[PDB]
Ligand binder design. Structure first.
Ligand SMILES: CCCCCCCCCCCCCCCCCC(=O)OC[C@H](COP(=O)([O-])OCC(O)COP(=O)([O-])OC[C@@H](COC(=O)CCCCCCCCCCCCCCCCC)OC(=O)CCCCCCCCCCCCCCCCC)OC(=O)CCCCCCCCCCCCCCCCC
Ligand SMILES: CCCCCCCCCCCCCCCCCC(=O)OC[C@H](COP(=O)(O)OCCN)OC(=O)CCCCCCCCCCCCCCCCC
Ligand SMILES: CCCCCCCCCCCCCCCCCC(=O)OC[C@H](COP(=O)(O)OCCN)OC(=O)CCCCCCCCCCCCCCCCC
Ligand SMILES: CCCCCCCCCCCCCCCCCC(=O)OC[C@H](COP(=O)(O)OCCN)OC(=O)CCCCCCCCCCCCCCCCC
Ligand code: HEM
Ligand code: HEM
Lengths: 111, 89, 48, 101, 31, 380
């Protein structure tokens, strides 16, 4: 009736008796209103590395890196570069296979 | 600067906003910043550091947009992102 | 019949290199300006 | 009628609009009679229809389809716009009979 | 600052792929 | 306060090119007409260059064509863009009309009528511009079409008198051909402006055929960069045709000078008229042949009245999809038969293919449409 937490700057502004000290309504029950959600369905997951730059051993901190429960297979676990050379490897072997079949079909026919 | 001086002093009227400022200052800053220190921090704010800070925070950023209601004329994210910068400054 | 052969093939490989340089640029620009759209997920919340 | 039933089920599967989560009445061409029958719909069926159309539009934008578990099945395909459409053709044919006389 | 280098690179790879038949390769013979 | 919505030029540009709502699901086929627009621009540019060093004086007209190919620097290049851009123009035009037949875009009646008027105009300009370089093939095609136009009773006589301008080959014929080939592309551009203006009030069609007001996006910057990519790809294909294989589409026999006393062993226009020539190789009647060609083009304009189905696009219509693809198939059969000599067994293939084309346009799509109507429980 004196102060209510509001005003988008996190401040105790001034409100009314039915606005500050009765934030609930005078409705009987929760009526057949349109439903609510505050949940982004993007399912975004961020994994931090947080490694050490010294110690000259570097195996136990790669051990921490590869023991993760992301569900990713270990040949896409490094992130960018393994995905890059896996994509290029599979692309060049598909191109090589189709050019191999084209070469074999061209060699099957005579001149 | 004058509007911010009036905003910082005019809010601390009575006991309840002063107590709230004390509580969240000891919870966030770790200390209660006095109003004289607030004026002292306001004092050296001039135009070139204001535009430097605003270019650091507003210029060429990806914003977050929320909308509710008849928002069928609310532009796409490309138009808002393109309006976040200028072509020739 | 063709006194134009060498200059035609000169402009041919110049065109080929220019097109192979400037086509992935427009492809990446189109993919950016449509990947703003292809990440959109929609939901329907009727009052039931 | 087992010949017609299985062929209708196969033709519904091969028509393709069940793969994008549509009913039959969403696929109709919107003439003035179809738009008038749309205008006579209740609000909940109207909102369902426009959400299904929007879902179809941004599903075929990506050239993708719905997963097979949530395709529109043949038994749950409801002919919601059909009686309003029949009523609209009834009034239009009555109006053209009165204009002919 | 890019197009002239592009033009001379395309021209240079053109005489690299085509050797012994262009007119610019027999400048030493007659002049 | 903003210049995009208070300045009249920027208001027109914003309202017709930037903030125009477009469906978010249109495929690459919707680029094609825009390509046709810039294809027009390319020809006009080359047309300006062909206003430079071309004379309408038969022997020296062919000599001026050879001088454009040799004496004028980058003149051969302009001539080859003009020819291969006419080829690319008809490729894009055929795919544009195929999009219109497939995705139910013929329900826009006046846009369809402006389109078919544009299509008559552009076939006339292409044939008439084929006459201008004055080869043997252009001569013999011109004589065949003018005699076919003179075969009609008491109407074609004054048209031959105005067009040929004399007793035999003279310069007046080529001047009036060059005048008409100069003038009518600008009329094509005017009807393209009317085409866009009639499209603008009803919106663009999506491939699903549904009402796309639920999901619409601004034209800029999505379809702007999409059309830029399409323009770059079309330029790549056109310059690949010009700079690498300049005469794989062109008829080789056009390049020797015209002699009326000799008869060439195989008369042939370019490929984009050949299917129409197949109709001219279908029935042995002159005025019946002209009626067959005119009705075979005008049946596209009569096509929006034959839509008997309650759904617009062919995306959800598999039987009519099969019918459309055998329609494209036997149209390809006609455009292959048209470039063949008149011998066995090309005559029976051409006649049955023309009959099948007329049947697959006219009579069989209503039956397929009412079958589609019955198989989904909507037909009485
Ligand atoms: C093959 C292996 C890779 C593969 O399967 O790629 C699938 C992939 C399509 O997969 P998708 O995820 O379903 O497509 C959506 C993509 O986000 C976007 O892909 P899209 O399919 O929407 O592509 C738009 C389309 C846009 O095409 C057009 O706009 C066509 C314009 C007219 C073409 C010419 C007309 C005249 C022809 C006369 C003859 O682009 C193309 O057709 C190729 C553009 C290549 C640009 C340079 C790339 C380097 O195909 C390509 O990316 C094609 C190029 C690479 C091959
Ligand atoms: C036209 C005249 C009527 C023709 C009727 C036969 C058409 C072919 C057919 O039956 O296709 C449906 C196919 C197999 O039919 P099924 O249900 O397994 O056997 C009962 C026989 N109607 O069933 C399927 O392909 C099932 C499709 C959904 C899975
Ligand atoms: C070749 C194209 C092959 C192809 O991709 O066909 C499929 C596509 C239709 O795909 P759609 O039914 O939309 O399905 C999307 C999948 N969910 O098919 C299409 O998009 C085809 C659209 C028409 C393109 C072909 C036009 C052929 C040329 C016709 C010229 C003559 C027109 C009449 C002149 C008189
Ligand atoms: C039953 C089991 C086999 C069928 C179901 C398995 C999946 C088949 C591949 C998916 C594509 C598909 O459904 O193709 C069906 C297609 C359309 O068939 P439809 O037009 O209904 O009738 C045949 C001719 N009218 O069928 C065809 O296009 C085949 C007829 C082609 C005629 C060409 C002339
Ligand atoms: C108004 C602008 C135009 C002018 C001034 C013009 C002028 C000419 C001239 C002088 C020629 C003969 C020289 C040559 O063959 O290269 C020609 C040829 C030709 N024009 Fe055009 N033209 C114009 C637009 C068009 C358009 C829009 C088309 C497409 C419908 C077209 C199709 C052709 C064709 C097919 C040829 C024959 C090319 C060949 O022999 O291979 N022209 N034009
Ligand atoms: C002269 C060359 C032509 C040009 C420059 C041209 C231009 C255009 C443009 C810019 C559009 C809008 C973008 C698009 O949908 O592709 C369009 C759409 C359309 N055109 Fe053409 N057009 C031409 C020929 C034709 C012809 C011959 C027809 C008739 C068969 C036609 C019928 C249509 C239809 C029905 C649409 C609407 C399709 C849609 O928006 O989904 N056009 N045209």
């Amino acid at each position: 009736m004196y102060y209510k937490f509001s005003s988008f700057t996190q401040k105790l502004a001034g409100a009314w008796a039915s606005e500050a000290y009765t934030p609930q309504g005078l409705k009987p029950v929760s009526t057949e209103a349109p439903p609510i959600i505050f949940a982004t369905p993007t399912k975004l997951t961020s994994s931090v590395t947080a490694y050490d730059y010294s110690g000259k051993n570097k195996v136990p901190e790669l051990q921490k890196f590869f023991q993760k429960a992301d569900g990713v297979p270990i040949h896409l676990k490094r992130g960018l570069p393994d995905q890059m050379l896996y994509r290029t490897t599979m692309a060049l072997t598909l191109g090589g296979t189709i050019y191999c079949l084209i070469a074999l079909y061209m060699a099957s026919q005579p001149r | 600067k004058n509007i911010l001086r009036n905003a910082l002093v005019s809010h601390l009227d009575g006991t309840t906003p002063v107590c709230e400022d004390i509580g969240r200052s000891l919870l966030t800053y770790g200390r209660r910043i006095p109003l004289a220190e607030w004026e002292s921090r306001i004092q050296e704010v001039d135009a070139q550091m204001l535009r430097d800070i605003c270019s650091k925070y507003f210029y060429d950023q990806c914003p977050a947009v929320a909308g509710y209601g008849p928002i069928e004329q609310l532009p796409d994210y490309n138009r808002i992102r393109s309006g976040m910068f200028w072509l020739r400054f | 019949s063709e006194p134009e052969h060498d200059h035609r093939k000169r402009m041919g490989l110049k065109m080929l290199l220019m097109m192979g340089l400037l086509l992935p640029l427009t492809y990446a620009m189109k993919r950016h300006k449509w990947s703003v759209l292809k990440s959109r997920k929609l939901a329907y919340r009727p009052p039931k | 009628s087992k010949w017609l039933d299985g062929f209708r089920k196969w033709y519904y599967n091969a028509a393709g609009f069940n793969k994008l989560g549509l009913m039959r009445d969403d696929t109709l061409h919107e003439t003035e009679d179809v738009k008038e029958a749309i205008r006579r719909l209740p609000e909940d069926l109207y909102n369902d229809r426009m959400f299904r159309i929007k879902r179809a539009l941004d599903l075929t934008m990506r050239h993708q389809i719905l997963p097979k578990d949530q395709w529109t099945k043949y038994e749950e395909d409801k002919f919601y716009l059909e009686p309003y459409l029949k009523e609209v053709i009834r009034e239009r044919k009555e109006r053209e009979e009165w204009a002919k006389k | 600052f890019f197009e002239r280098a592009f033009d001379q690179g395309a021209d240079a790879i053109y005489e690299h792929i085509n050797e012994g038949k262009l007119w610019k390769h027999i400048k030493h013979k007659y002049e | 306060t903003n210049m995009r919505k208070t300045h009249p030029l920027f208001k027109i540009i914003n309202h017709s090119f930037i903030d125009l709502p477009a469906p978010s699901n249109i495929s690459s086929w919707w680029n094609f007409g825009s390509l046709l627009g810039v294809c027009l621009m390319v020809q006009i540019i080359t047309g300006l260059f062909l206003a430079m060093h071309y004379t309408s004086d038969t022997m020296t007209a062919f000599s001026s064509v050879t001088h454009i190919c040799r004496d004028v620097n980058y003149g051969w290049l302009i001539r080859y863009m003009h020819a291969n851009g006419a080829s690319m123009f008809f490729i894009c035009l055929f795919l544009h009309v195929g999009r219109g037949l497939y995705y139910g875009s013929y329900t826009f009646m006046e846009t369809w009528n402006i389109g078919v008027l544009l299509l008559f105009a552009v076939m006339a300009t292409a044939f008439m511009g084929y006459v201008l370089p004055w080869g043997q093939m252009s001569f013999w095609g011109a004589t065949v079409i003018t005699n076919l136009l003179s075969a009609i009773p008491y109407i074609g006589t004054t048209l031959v008198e105005w067009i040929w301008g004399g007793f035999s080959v003279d310069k007046a014929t080529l001047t009036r051909f060059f005048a008409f080939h100069f003038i009518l592309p600008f009329i094509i551009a005017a009807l393209a402006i009317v085409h866009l203006l009639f499209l603008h009030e009803t919106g663009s069609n999506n491939p699903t055929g549904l009402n796309s007001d639920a999901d619409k996006i601004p034209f800029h910057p999505y379809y702007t960069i999409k059309d830029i990519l399409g323009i770059l790809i079309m330029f790549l294909i056109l310059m690949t045709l010009v700079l690498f294989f300049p005469d794989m589409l062109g008829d080789p026999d056009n390049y020797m000078p015209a002699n009326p006393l000799n008869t060439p062993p195989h008369i042939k226009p370019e490929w984009y008229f050949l299917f129409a020539y197949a109709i001219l190789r279908s029935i042995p009647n002159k005025l019946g042949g002209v009626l067959a060609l005119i009705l075979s083009i005008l049946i596209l304009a009569l096509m929006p009245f034959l839509h008997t189905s309650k759904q617009r696009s062919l995306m959800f219509r598999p039987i009519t999809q099969i019918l459309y693809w055998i329609l494209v198939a036997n149209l390809l059969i006609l455009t292959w038969i048209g470039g063949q000599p008149v011998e066995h067994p090309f005559i029976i293939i051409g006649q049955l293919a023309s009959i099948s084309y007329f049947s697959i346009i006219l009579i069989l799509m209503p039956i397929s449409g009412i079958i589609e109507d019955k198989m989904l429980k909507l037909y009485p």
